[PDB]
Structures are given as C-alpha cells and as structure tokens.
C-alpha cells in the first residue's frame, strides 16, 4: 500500500496511537545482561534504555568493554549505523574511543546540550581552536579545526589524535540545532536538507566505518534519522517503490536496538519525511 495513501487513512481516522501501539507490542525482546551489571550503572543515562547483548558495541579494552551503543545492520539497504546515548561526564572518553576503533568518519547530533532547563548530554567537543581537549582515560586528543554555522544546523571539522601512536584523523560533526523542546517539527524540510548534507559528506558510505548517531537516549530522534534514510534508499533500489513498508522496516531495526521511535508523533513525522523526501528520490 502506497504509504502516502496509508498516511491520509491514519490521519483522517486519527489512529496514530493505535498504529504505534501495535509496533510496541510486536517488537523484539532480547537480553541486555551486560548493561544491567552493577559495575556499569554510571555508564547508562536512563535505566529503561539498554543495548541488547547480541548487537552492542564493544570497547577494545580488557578492563570494561561496555558502552551504551548498538550496531544497526540493514542488509537489503546495505547501510550500517551506530546508535548511542548522549555521552555522560564519565563516558566522554569511551565515546571518542568508540569513534576511533570503529573507523567512523562522522558523528550526527540531534539535540542541544541543554533543553527544557536540564542537561541532556556532556559538552564533549572543544568550542575554541586554541583550547583542545585531552581524554586521559583513553589517551586521545581532540581539536576544533573549523566551524560552519547555518540557520538549522552547524558543521564542524575536528581532528582526533590517538596519542599512543600519534595517528590523526578528520572527523565531521553534524549538529542539528533546531528540533523543538516539545513535539516534532511542523515540516520535515529542514531535517531532510540535513540528512542530504550528511550523505554528501561520505560519512554514510561503505568506505568508512558506521556513522555514530545520538540524541539524549539514542532511540527517538536518532531512530527517525536512520528510519528515514534506510526507507528512501530502498525506494531508490527497488523495482516497485510502493512496496516499501515503513512499519516493517522499523520492526527490523528494533531487532537491533529497543525503543526506536518514542511517540506516535515521531512515527507520523517519519512517514511525512519519507513521503516528502521521495519527491526527490523519484527524479525531481
């Protein structure tokens, strides 16, 4: 069923809550035993959001290999993403350790450091060229190279140095700054414009490791980003673009991380973004 028609159908009948609850009922449940170990309580921002053991990212240290992050592997679309929580004060060094070990080219950030008067993630990158950051627990140096501030997003060039080997790499930070404190955006135009800028950079391409994407919990805004990307890529690839079923793709992605898409408003917005973004994918 053409999603666009399915869309008007749900909208006229006002069934978005009932659709979303079907998804929550059919979604996978797998064990997350490593996340719940007592030695990791201060590595988890929220008690009810954990990586499954089968898909979690492991740090390459013998000490404690745990970080609240998951590998979403999309086999038909040939895309992979790492979804993670906003870094905590005790995990900023683990975050950049992961970015290095997994060979990512880009980091995607969908939240502000402060929202609704409270801190949603640590200030984990440097704000001035001449004031670099050193993560002594994981032996890494991070320097701001350049900054391009636009109306709806900011792009930053960062240098990450492994102080153990003195290798350096360029990391691109893509920061969407205008998601509202409550609800979802009214039009998906600026979110789609942002997604295409990430694509154009090479950060989503198979010559690099998976992009790292995060919001506060790493499941809501972050889920919207990867669901919309994967769905548009499948409409490109398939003989019949109408065969792309957004609810089935979301359930496949939830085999890899719990809770992706947090509200019925986020579900609706994901439909809207795919429908509108298809009006370039099909040749316009």
Swiss-Prot record:
Oxidized on Cys-215; the Cys-SOH formed in response to redox signaling reacts with the alpha-amido of the following residue to form a sulfenamide cross-link, triggering a conformational change that inhibits substrate binding and activity. The active site can be restored by reduction. The modification Phosphotyrosine is found at residues 20, 66. The modification S-nitrosocysteine is found at residue 215. GO terms for biological process: actin cytoskeleton organization; cellular response to angiotensin; cellular response to fibroblast growth factor stimulus; cellular response to hypoxia; cellular response to nerve growth factor stimulus; cellular response to nitric oxide; cellular response to platelet-derived growth factor stimulus; cellular response to unfolded protein. The modification Cysteine sulfenic acid (-SOH) is found at residue 215. The modification Cysteine persulfide is found at residue 215. The modification Phosphoserine is found at residues 50, 242-243. Residues 3-277 form the Tyrosine-protein phosphatase domain. The modification Cysteine sulfinic acid (-SO2H) is found at residue 215. It comes from the Eukaryota. The active site is at 215 (phosphocysteine intermediate). The modification N-acetylmethionine is found at residue 1. It is an enzyme of class 3 (hydrolase). Expressed in keratinocytes (at protein level). Substrate binds at residues 181, 215-221, 262. GO terms for molecular function: cadherin binding; enzyme binding; ephrin receptor binding; insulin receptor binding; non-membrane spanning protein tyrosine phosphatase activity; protein kinase binding; protein phosphatase 2A binding; protein tyrosine phosphatase activity. It is a peripheral membrane protein. It catalyses: O-phospho-L-tyrosyl-[protein] + H2O = L-tyrosyl-[protein] + phosphate. GO terms for cellular component: cytoplasm; cytoplasmic side of endoplasmic reticulum membrane; cytosol; early endosome; endoplasmic reticulum; endosome lumen; glutamatergic synapse; mitochondrial crista. There is a cross-link at residues 215-216 (N,N-(cysteine-1,S-diyl)serine (Cys-Ser)). Its EC number is 3.1.3.48. It is found in: Endoplasmic reticulum membrane. Belongs to the protein-tyrosine phosphatase family. Non-receptor class 1 subfamily. Interacts with EPHA3 (phosphorylated); dephosphorylates EPHA3 and may regulate its trafficking and function. Interacts with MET. Interacts with NCK1. Tyrosine-protein phosphatase which acts as a regulator of endoplasmic reticulum unfolded protein response. Mediates dephosphorylation of EIF2AK3/PERK; inactivating the protein kinase activity of EIF2AK3/PERK. May play an important role in CKII- and p60c-src-induced signal transduction cascades. May regulate the EFNA5-EPHA3 signaling pathway which modulates cell reorganization and cell-cell repulsion. May also regulate the hepatocyte growth factor receptor signaling pathway through dephosphorylation of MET. This is Tyrosine-protein phosphatase non-receptor type 1. It comes from Homo sapiens.
């Amino acid at each position: 069923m053409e999603m666009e028609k399915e869309f008007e159908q749900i909208d006229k009948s006002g069934s978005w809550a009932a659709i979303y609850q079907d998804i929550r009922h059919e979604a996978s449940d797998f064990p997350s035993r490593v996340a719940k170990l007592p030695k990791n309580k201060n590595r988890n921002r929220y008690r009810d959001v954990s990586p499954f053991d089968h898909s979690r990212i492991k740090l390459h240290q013998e000490d404690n290999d745990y970080i609240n992050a998951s590998l979403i592997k999309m086999e038909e679309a040939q895309r992979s993403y790492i979804l993670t929580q906003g870094p905590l004060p005790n995990t900023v060094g683990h975050f950049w350790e992961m970015v290095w070990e997994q060979k990512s080219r880009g980091v995607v950030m969908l939240n502000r450091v402060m929202e609704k008067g409270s801190l949603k993630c640590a200030q984990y990158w440097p704000q001035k060229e001449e004031k670099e950051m050193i993560f002594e627990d994981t032996n890494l140096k991070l320097t701001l190279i350049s900054e391009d501030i636009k109306s709806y997003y900011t792009v930053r060039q960062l240098e990450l140095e492994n102080l153990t080997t003195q290798e350096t790499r360029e990391i691109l930070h893509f920061h969407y700054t205008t998601w509202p404190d409550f609800g979802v955006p009214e039009s998906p135009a600026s979110f789609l414009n942002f997604l295409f800028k990430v694509r154009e950079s090479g950060s989503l391409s198979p010559e690099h490791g998976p992009v790292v994407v995060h919001c506060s919990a790493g499941i809501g805004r972050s889920g919207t980003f990867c669901l919309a990307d994967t769905c548009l890529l499948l409409m490109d690839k398939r003989k019949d673009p109408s065969s792309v079923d957004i609810k089935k793709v979301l359930l496949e992605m939830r085999k890899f991380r719990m809770g992706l898409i947090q509200t019925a408003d986020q579900l609706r917005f994901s439909y809207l973004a795919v429908i509108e973004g298809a009006k370039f994918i099909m040749g316009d």
